[PDB]
Design a protein around this nucleic acid. Sequence first.
DNA 1: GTTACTTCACTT
DNA 2: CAAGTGAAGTAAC
Length: 114
Amino acid sequence: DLEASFTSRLPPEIVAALKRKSSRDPNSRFPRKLHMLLTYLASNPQLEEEIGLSWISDTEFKMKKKNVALVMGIKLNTLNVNLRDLAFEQLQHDKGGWTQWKRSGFTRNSVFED
DNA sequence: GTTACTTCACTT
DNA sequence: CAAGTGAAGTAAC
Ligand SMILES: [Zn+2]
Ligand SMILES: [Zn+2]
Ligand SMILES: [Zn+2]
Ligand SMILES: [Zn+2]
Ligand SMILES: [Zn+2]
Ligand SMILES: [Zn+2]
Ligand SMILES: [Zn+2]
């Protein structure tokens, strides 16, 4: 009912890119999925609220992993595993479900490497 | 066969 | 307890 309200409210394109299997195509990878998500929520304030994924500066974002794992279709645990293995660096302990982050070359208008 | 995850049942 | 570990798996390429 919640994921249903989340995905049902975001564009078919994003739902599909989120559903797409991760291969060697860089757009199919987790960083760019996070990035397209982040980029889009930037324009949908209401959804950005409900989900909890937004930039706090040109280089840091905060999120509610519990909700982000949902809209992305992955267990909480795999979300953490992906942040860990892709070199996202946590800048804050969980507080009311919010966590903060940064990753080199991952900004408002850039997603580097792979 | 490779790659880029994905998941689970613990542990910390 | 939120987040990490180690072993095992999945499927597009
Ligand atoms: Zn982007
Ligand atoms: Zn689902
Ligand atoms: Zn094979
Ligand atoms: Zn415990
Ligand atoms: Zn591991
Ligand atoms: Zn393995
Ligand atoms: Zn394996």
